C-alpha cells in the first residue's frame, strides 16, 4: 500500500535492504532502516520524517537536498500541486519621493515534504533556499507553524 505506487521502485538510497537468515519473524521490527538526517539551524527533524514509511528525494528530512543560504517565511495560499505548495510573501516597497510604501508580493512555489502533514491555507510557513529543485521551485518548506489566527 501507499509507498510503491508510481512505476519505478522508490527507495532511500544508502540503505541496502535485505540480508536475513536469522529468526525473530522476517526482517527487523523497523523492517526498513530509514535514512533520515538532521538538517541544521536547529530545526527539529520532525517525527513523521523519522517515523514515516514514506519517500520523497526532495524532502530534507528524508533525502538528498542541502539547505544552504537564505531562510525566509511566507503564507500558504494554494495546495493544488503534489509535493509543492505556493506561498505568498507580503511587504512594503518604499518610494522615497512620496515618503510612503506600497504593498507588494512575490508568490513563490516551494517544495512541501509529505512528512509535514496537516498543513492548510492561511498558514505561516518557513522556508530554506535549496538546490534549484524544479523550474520555478528553489525553496523547500522547513517548519510549518500554523500559528497566527486559529485553533488546534
Amino acid at each position: 500500500a501507499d509507498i510503491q505506487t508510481e512505476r519505478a521502485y522508490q527507495k532511500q538510497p544508502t540503505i541496502f535492504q535485505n540480508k536475513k537468515r536469522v529468526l525473530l519473524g522476517e526482517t527487523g521490527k523497523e523492517k526498513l532502516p530509514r535514512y533520515y538526517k538532521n538538517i541544521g539551524l536547529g530545526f527539529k527533524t520532525p517525527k513523521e520524517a523519522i517515523e514515516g514509511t514514506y519517500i520523497d528525494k526532495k524532502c530534507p528530512f528524508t533525502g538528498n537536498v542541502s539547505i544552504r543560504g537564505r531562510i525566509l517565511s511566507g503564507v500558504v495560499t494554494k495546495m493544488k500541486m503534489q509535493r509543492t505548495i505556493v506561498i505568498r510573501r507580503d511587504y512594503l516597497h518604499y518610494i522615497r519621493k512620496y515618503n510612503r510604501f506600497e504593498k507588494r508580493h512575490k508568490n513563490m512555489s516551494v517544495h512541501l515534504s509529505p512528512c509535514f502533514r496537516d498543513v492548510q491555507i492561511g498558514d505561516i510557513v518557513t522556508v530554506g533556499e535549496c538546490r534549484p529543485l524544479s523550474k520555478t521551485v528553489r525553496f523547500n518548506v522547513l517548519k510549518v507553524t500554523k500559528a497566527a489566527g486559529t485553533k488546534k
Binding site: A8, K11, F16, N18, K19, R21, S109
Partner: protein, 206 residues
Amino acid sequence: GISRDNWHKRRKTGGKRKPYHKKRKYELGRPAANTKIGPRRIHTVRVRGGNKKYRALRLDVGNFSWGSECCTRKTRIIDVVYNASNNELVRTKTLVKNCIVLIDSTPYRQWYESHYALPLGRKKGAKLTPEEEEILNKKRSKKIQKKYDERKKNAKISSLLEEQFQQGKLLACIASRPGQCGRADGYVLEGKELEFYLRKIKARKG
C-alpha cells in the same frame, strides 16, 4: 545545435521571453546514445573542460552485483525487460539507467559452488556429481569443513532468486549511465525490488 537553456521557454506566469544572445557553447546538447545490446561499441567524445565522455552505442556486458552476498562478477547482459520511463526503450532494447535487464547467472552460481558448496536450480546428477564433489571431496578437512560449516545455514537464497538460477538469467537493474559513463553497471534485483518488477512484467503481458 540542440540547446539546453532556460533562455527560450515561457516564464512562470506565461509571458514569452524574448531572446537575448545567440545559442552559446554552453547550453549544448548532443544527440542521444540510446545504447543497444551488441558486440561492444563505444565512441569517445570531447566535452567541456578538456575531459572526455564514453558514449556507449553497443554494449554487451556489465560489472554489476549481488547486494547481499557482496560480489560482482562481470557478466553478459542478455536482454531488456521493462524500463519505467517508456516502452519503446524496452522493445528497442535500449539500456539506460534503471533499465531492468536479464543477465547471465553463471558467474554467480560459480562461487556459491566454490564458497558454500551447495547447488542451484535442481538436477538429477549429470553436472552436479562430476564437478560439485570435485569442488567438495576434501583431503584437507578439519579446518575447511569447520569453515564452510561456519559458512553455515545462510548459504541461503530467497526462493525468488533460487528460481531464476534454474534459467541461468538474473534480474538486475542498471545504475550507471551507458551514454555518459561507458558501462552498464548495476545491482541484482534482490528481495523487495525483485517483487514489483516481476509483478510489473506479469501484469504487463497480462
